[PDB]
Amino acid sequence: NVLKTSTLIRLVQLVVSFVSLWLTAAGFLHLLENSGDPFFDFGNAQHLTYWECLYFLMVTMSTVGFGDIFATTVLGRTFVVIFIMIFIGLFASFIPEIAEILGKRQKYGGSYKKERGKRHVVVCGYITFDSVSNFLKDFLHKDREDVDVEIVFLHKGLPGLELEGLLKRHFTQVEYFWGSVMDANDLERVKIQEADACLVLANKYCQDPDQEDAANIMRVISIKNYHSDIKVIVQLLQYHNKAYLLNIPSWDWKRGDDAVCVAELKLGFIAQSCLAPGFSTLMANLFTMRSYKPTPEMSQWQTDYMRGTGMEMYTEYLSSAFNALTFPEAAELCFSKLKLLLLAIEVRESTLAINPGPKVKIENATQGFFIAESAEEVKRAFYYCKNCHANVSDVRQIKKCKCRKFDSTGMFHWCPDRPLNDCLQDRSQASASGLRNHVVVCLFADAASPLIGLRNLVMPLRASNFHYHELKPTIIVGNLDYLHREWKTLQNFPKLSILPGSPLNRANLRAVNINLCDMCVIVSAKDRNMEDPNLVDKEAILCSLNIKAMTFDDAGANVPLITELANDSNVQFLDQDDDDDPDTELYMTQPFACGTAFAVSVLDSLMSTSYFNDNALTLIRTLITGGATPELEQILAEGAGMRGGYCSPAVLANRDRCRVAQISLFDGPLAQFGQGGHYGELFVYALRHFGILCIGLYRFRDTNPSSKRYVITNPPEDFPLLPTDQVYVLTYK
Amino acid sequence: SCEPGDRQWYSFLASSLVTFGSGLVVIIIYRIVLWLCGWMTEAKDWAGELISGQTTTGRILVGLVFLLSIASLIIYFIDASTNTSVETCLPWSSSTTQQVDLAFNVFFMIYFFIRFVAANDKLWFWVELFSFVDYFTIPPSFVAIYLDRNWLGLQFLRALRLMSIPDILTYLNVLKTSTLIRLVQLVVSFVSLWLTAAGFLHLLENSGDPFFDFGNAQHLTYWECLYFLMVTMSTVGFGDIFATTVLGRTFVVIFIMIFIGLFASFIPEIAEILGKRQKYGGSYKKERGKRHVVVCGYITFDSVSNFLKDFLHKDREDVDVEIVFLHKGLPGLELEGLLKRHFTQVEYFWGSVMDANDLERVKIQEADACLVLANKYCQDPDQED
């Protein structure tokens, strides 16, 4: 019982039948030629050896037919005719079928040779030239700390030729293996018990994001079942699917397990843009590694913008010279002397504190969070000695010295459930409503389309650190049958309403007072990979262009818009007076540089930053979610909906948290800096007098006449200010 | 020249076998010692980065491997095209080709050791294809200094070094497109396999069968073997040339069983790759004073002929407007004929009005109008609109 596999059975049948037929035919020709024709009295004969017949039959069977040897008995020639009619078919079918069987061998078999002292990270799920190149470009990036981590891809496919080239170019630091994380033997080959982490990548452009999340949850189950203590980081396409992996017995966020939920993230970034218009661009640039590389073809505003895109957020320990400073004094010092924007600290269990007030002291081995141009910049905060050694002049000289109701967790405003018909309005009722300074959501959906999770858009806008009087009213224009399915998650948020119908219908937009809103959000639940790559965003593009072309009476392109895009390229159609070259990547385009466009692609480096510094991923979240703690994520995973009511002062204490806000240099106490001051003067003044920590500017592109503005992340200390500038700040008021 | 009788080929062959065998044994006894019982990994990583062309010194070394693997093969063509006997007595101090060959063999010996370091498993490395090319090339070239004689033995394997070229042109990041990667893999593997097979047949036929005391021999040139293998590989088989050593005939049988499949798959796949080139590329040459109209959307023999019959019509004012079709398809044969009949006044370009570069090629800023035609007989008129 030794021929077990069907291919191995077929192989031995092919080879043995071919070889035995070739040998028996050669022996028959050898009889005929050497014996000679019987009706010519055996006189016509030709003394071929057996081996000459064997060679001659291969030469004729293959149709090469050299004719160095040939048959000459009429029985030998008639046998050669019969042989030609049979054996050309045998050879012409045998050679391809053997070639297919031998071509079937699995290439990327074998196992990872674990080196003496190298970390490795197993990477699996959606592995392709695009997802791997996007992942590796940020993971291997030249401005990281140069930790010698190996990347080990585990996937069922053969890699494509483009991916084979990329794997060959990174041969010294990247591996690929054929296999699946669903198989415990493949988990053994990649030595996953000795891996530093496992990363599960998701197909963001799948036809069914619940099906893709179901597959990725079963992977984390398989990985955790094989060994519970592996740090797993998984990409989720849907927020409700996070509940399923929160219920896995071995899942633990204190162990560093995480779900990078792109629905929760995209809607948090655009929701913070409703509170501070360009903040999705401010903030999405911090979490991807990019680099400043000017050209004289750039306008002056593009050189400011692109300097800002050169920022990333970094974690480093504050030197002992910071010990017992208040956080404000440490931030003044770190900005003014070290040229670093310190914005948060890890306070000892331990917790993240963002822009904490004078009451919080720095302590020995405090980790700080900085915005800076490279990892080599933030080292300076560890190296700084104060008067105990070098501490003066050039930043290159520091060197090294040696000397109302709420959610039950208090975090969001809350109200008891309601039926959707309590919040449904009509074009008339709506217009009646005095809407102003509101948020409008233009929602494109079919009744059957996948849930986008608008709770992640409405929740950040209903945080407890706002007073109720300053909560922006929210109105959703969209398909009613879709909204009935969504409503089970929305029904606990106050100041919320629905106007059923198309967002392209101009009478809906006018009833909604689209001209009076603080932000219009354009968002789509439609098929994110429908047939034509130019049709995918047509609803969002038409909605943008429609609103931008309207007119109003006691306008149009003046109204604030943010649009989610399914295909980053379609950004070129989204606005006029761009004049961007269509070869430009999204982050350099005018609509992205102003915060008018957003796309899920900018979130990809949240996988790599989740691996390199988990705490940085919890900061971005605390900000963009408005404060969704893992207690709330557990309370929602209990399936009872968002439980809330009145609160004790003990939980309600948390109402005071740092918020991203925007302030104008046109009037009030800071206008003295708008009148030809510098960003460093403003930063130090606002920090000290108000605890207001400045993180960037939002400046008019047309300084001489459109309303566009652009975002300058972390300007230089000597950067000039205009009275029309607006300032991104972190504040407790 | 040569020497009557006095065969010494087995001394050259032995140098390749003892160099192969001794290193294989040293690995096996070390594996057994580590089975019965840092700077190493730093060196392995450094050498891996170097041979992968990741460092700038690696890109220099990777360029030298490309140049010197081709030069090392050209010195084999010069030897194989000028040596008459397979062994040849000649003092190395006289032969300039064998002197520049020593410099190349030193380079490939250094490159072999670098690659040793970088290797993850030394046993598998000692059995890689290029490791055999090195054992059968380099040690015999040193024996050819020690004795005043050379043997044109397994030297044909130097042609296999060409199979590194697709990797070098991946390390240097120049093979960008997947079709261009596939093209260079096909051509270089085919050409190097054809050359190495011709050199092996040339050894066998010119040396003769060993069990017939080397008396059965046939003095083919290398180029006659190269031609004969193309003629048999393609199955044309003229038989103007044929092998007659039993080792040459058994090699021709093995070659027929392998290389007919290679040729019969190679020729179609190259023909598909070269057939893939985009025909109606390029750009509209805007004439000194002619209007042009860009036409796009539903472009077909029907829609174009219906459009042109009324647009070009003889009873119009005879304004000299050019029509410029912009569409993603290749035009069908009926539409190609119609475009040829109107050559002086109609143009067609491959592209889409969705791409700003294609709008630039048709010079649409200087167009008098753009016409967007619709598929009136589509399944979904809202999708078409």
Report the C-alpha gap between B93 and B145 in whole angstroms: 9
Q: Are A3 and A12 in contact (CB under 8 A)?
A: yes
Resolution (A): 2.8
Q: Token pair 């990363």 is at which residue?
A: A199
Give me the phi and psi of B297, to 5 degrees please: 90, -130
* Helices within chain B (DSSP H only): 9-36, 39-51, 56-80, 96-118, 122-125, 129-146, 165-171, 178-207, 222-233, 246-275, 301-311, 333-341, 356-361, 381-384
Tell me the residue type at A577. D
Report the C-alpha gap between A29 and A75 in whole angstroms: 9
Question: Shortest Cα distance from A107 to chain B (angstroms)?
Answer: 15
* Helices within A554-629 (DSSP H only): 590-593, 606-612, 614-624
Report the C-alpha gap between A24 and A39 in whole angstroms: 24
C-alpha dihedral, A125 to A128 to A130 to A132, nearest 10°: 60
Report the C-alpha gap between A692 and A300 in whole angstroms: 28
* Residues 485-544 of chain A whose Cβ lies under 8 A from any Cβ of chain B: 534
Q: Is the sign of the CA dihedral B244, B250, B256, B259 positive or negative?
A: negative
What number of C-beta contacts closer than 8 Å exist between A and B?
Answer: 80
Report the C-alpha gap between A246 and A258 in whole angstroms: 10
The DSSP symbol for A44 reads S
With an 8 Å Cβ cutoff, the interface of chain B facing chain A consists of: 38, 40-41, 45, 48-49, 52-54, 120-121, 167, 170-171, 173, 175, 178, 181-182, 232, 235-239, 242, 244, 246, 249-250, 252-253, 256-257, 260-261, 354-357
Residue A178's CB is within 10 A of a number of other CB atoms, namely 18
User: For A96, which of B244, B253, B261 is closest by C-beta distance?
Assistant: B261
Report the C-alpha gap between A312 and A619 in whole angstroms: 13
Return the closest-CA partner of residue A506 out of A517, A515, A493. A515
How many CA atoms does the CB half-sphere of A377 hold within 13 Å? 21
Which two three-digit tokens encode residue A293? 């590389």
Which two three-digit tokens encode residue B116? 């040793």
C-alpha dihedral, A629 to A633 to A634 to A637, nearest 10°: 170
Ramachandran class of A155: left when φ > 0, alpha when ψ lies in -120 to 50, beta otherwise: beta
Q: Are A544 and A570 in contact (CB under 8 A)?
A: no
Return the closest-CA partner of residue A287 out of A254, A260, A318, A259. A260
How many CA atoms does the CB half-sphere of A84 hold within 13 Å? 13
Chain B residue whose CA is closest to A114:
B120
Which two three-digit tokens encode residue A80? 């050669």
Report the C-alpha gap between A506 and A510 in whole angstroms: 6
Which two three-digit tokens encode residue B44? 């392995």
Report the C-alpha gap between A549 and B118 in whole angstroms: 63
Which two three-digit tokens encode residue B370? 């753009």
Angle A219-A223-A224 from CA coordinates, rounded to 5°: 115
Return the closest-CA partner of residue B361 out of B337, B335, B331, B327. B327
Distance between alpha carbon B47 and the CA centroid of its chain, in Å? Answer: 26
Q: Are A491 and A417 in contact (CB under 8 A)?
A: yes
Q: Token pair 């020639």 is at which residue?
A: A77
Tell me the residue type at A462. R
Which two three-digit tokens encode residue A130? 């695009």
Q: What three-state secondary structure class fits A289?
A: coil
The DSSP symbol for B263 reads H
Experimental method: cryo-EM
Q: Is the sign of the CA dihedral B32, B38, B41, B44 positive or negative?
A: negative
DSSP A55-83: HHHHHHHTT----SS---SHHHHHHHHHH
Report the C-alpha gap between A397 and A380 in whole angstroms: 10
Report the C-alpha gap between A728 and B15 in whole angstroms: 75
Tell me the residue type at A103. G
Return the closest-CA partner of residue B241 out of A52, A49, A64. A64
Q: Are A522 and A503 in contact (CB under 8 A)?
A: yes
Report the C-alpha gap between B327 and B345 in whole angstroms: 17
Binding residues of B for Ca(2+): 315
Q: Is the sign of the CA dihedral A49, A50, A53, A58 positive or negative?
A: negative
Return the closest-CA partner of residue A479 out of A511, A443, A455. A443
CB contact, 8 Å: A172 with chain B? Answer: yes
Q: Are A196 and A121 in contact (CB under 8 A)?
A: yes
Report the C-alpha gap between A125 and A215 in whole angstroms: 9
Distance between alpha carbon B281 and the CA centroid of its chain, in Å? Answer: 27
Q: Are A62 and A91 in contact (CB under 8 A)?
A: yes
Give me the phi and psi of A439, to 5 degrees please: -110, 125
Q: Token pair 């005391």 is at which residue?
A: B213
Q: Are A289 and A263 in contact (CB under 8 A)?
A: no
Q: Are A417 and A496 in contact (CB under 8 A)?
A: no
Angle A165-A170-A171 from CA coordinates, rounded to 5°: 90
Using an 8 Å CB-CB cutoff, list chain B residues near A171. Answer: 48, 52
Sheet holding A341-347, edge to edge: A312-317, A367-372, A341-347, A351-354
The DSSP symbol for B88 reads E
Question: Shortest Cα distance from B89 to chain A (angstroms)?
Answer: 35
Mode of pairing for the β-strands spanning A693-700 and A726-731: antiparallel
Which two three-digit tokens encode residue A717? 């200390």
Q: B129 Cβ partners below 8 Å, 6+ apart?
A: B160, B163
Furthest CA-CA distance within chain B: 100
Report the C-alpha gap between A723 and A452 in whole angstroms: 40
Q: Token pair 């030069």 is at which residue?
A: B71
Report the C-alpha gap between A707 and A701 in whole angstroms: 8
Tell me the residue type at B258. I
Furthest CA-CA distance within chain A: 127
Using an 8 Å CB-CB cutoff, list chain B residues near A62. Answer: 235, 256-257, 260
CB contact, 8 Å: A113 with chain B? Answer: yes
Distance between alpha carbon A500 and the CA centroid of its chain, in Å? Answer: 32
Report the C-alpha gap between B232 and B253 in whole angstroms: 10
> Which segments of A502-592 are extended strands (E)?
519-524, 561-565
The terminus-to-terminus CA distance of chain A in angstroms comes to 80
Q: Are A480 and A500 in contact (CB under 8 A)?
A: yes
Mode of pairing for the β-strands spanning A659-664 and A726-731: antiparallel
Give me the phi and psi of B221, to 5 degrees please: -75, 165
Return the closest-CA partner of residue A369 out of A164, A108, A609, A655. A609
CB burial class (10 A; 0-12, 13-18, 19+) of residue B286?
middle
Binding residues of B for Mg(2+): 287, 322, 347
How far lies A538's CA from each of A499, A508, A564, A565, A567, in Å?
A: 22, 19, 12, 10, 11
Report the C-alpha gap between A577 and B18 in whole angstroms: 75
Residue A212's CB is within 10 A of a number of other CB atoms, namely 22
Q: Which helix (H) or strand (E) holds A211?
A: helix A209-226
Q: A676 Cβ partners below 8 Å, 6+ apart?
A: A720, A721
Q: Which helix (H) or strand (E) holds A253?
A: none
How far lies A590's CA from each of A319, A571, A594, A712, B179, in Å?
A: 40, 9, 6, 13, 35
Q: Is the sign of the CA dihedral A395, A396, A397, A400 positive or negative?
A: positive
Report the C-alpha gap between A526 and A544 in whole angstroms: 16
Produce one character per residue of B288-322: b if its CB has 16 or more CB atoms within 10 Å, e if not.
Answer: eeeebebbbebbbbebbeebbeebeeeeeeeeebb
Distance between alpha carbon B248 and the CA centroid of its chain, in Å? Answer: 27
Integer-rounded Cα Rg, in Å, for chain B is 31
Report the C-alpha gap between B262 and B265 in whole angstroms: 5
Integer-rounded Cα Rg, in Å, for chain A is 34
Distance between alpha carbon B153 and the CA centroid of its chain, in Å? Answer: 25
Using an 8 Å CB-CB cutoff, list chain A residues near B237. Answer: 59, 63-67
Give me the phi and psi of A629, to 5 degrees please: -75, 160
Which two three-digit tokens encode residue A500? 């059923």
Report the C-alpha gap between A520 and A563 in whole angstroms: 8
Report the C-alpha gap between B312 and B331 in whole angstroms: 20
Q: A281 Cβ partners below 8 Å, 6+ apart?
A: A592, A593, A594, A595, A711
Q: Token pair 């708008």 is at which residue?
A: A674
Using an 8 Å CB-CB cutoff, list chain B residues near A51. Answer: 246
Return the closest-CA partner of residue B321 out of B296, B353, B344. B344
Q: Which helix (H) or strand (E) holds A693?
A: strand A693-700
Helix and strand numbers (H, E) in chain A are: 25, 22
CB contact, 8 Å: A162 with chain B? Answer: yes
Report the C-alpha gap between A277 and A282 in whole angstroms: 10
The terminus-to-terminus CA distance of chain B in angstroms comes to 83
Report the C-alpha gap between A411 and A463 in whole angstroms: 6
Q: Are A521 and A442 in contact (CB under 8 A)?
A: yes
The interaxial angle of helices B246-275 and B222-233, nearest 10 deg, is 60
DSSP A147-175: --PEEEEEESSPPPHHHHHHHHHTTTTEE
Tell me the residue type at A727. V
Residue A350's CB is within 10 A of a number of other CB atoms, namely 11
Question: Shortest Cα distance from A172 to chain B (angstroms)?
Answer: 6
The DSSP symbol for A518 reads S
Give me the phi and psi of A351, to 5 degrees please: -145, 150
Return the closest-CA partner of residue A496 out of A465, A473, A466, A526. A473
Mode of pairing for the β-strands spanning A496-500 and A474-478: parallel
Contacts 24+ apart (CB under 8 A), A390-397: A391/A337, A395/A338, A395/A339
Report the C-alpha gap between A488 and A641 in whole angstroms: 8
Q: Are A65 and B237 in contact (CB < 8 Å)?
A: yes
Q: Are A84 and A60 in contact (CB under 8 A)?
A: yes
Produce one character per residue of A423-445: b if its CB has 16 or more CB atoms within 10 Å, e if not.
Answer: bbbebeebbebebeebbbbbbbb
Q: Are B193 and B262 in contact (CB under 8 A)?
A: yes
Report the C-alpha gap between A703 and A722 in whole angstroms: 9
Q: Are A664 and A726 in contact (CB under 8 A)?
A: yes
Return the closest-CA partner of residue A156 out of A125, A197, A195, A132. A125
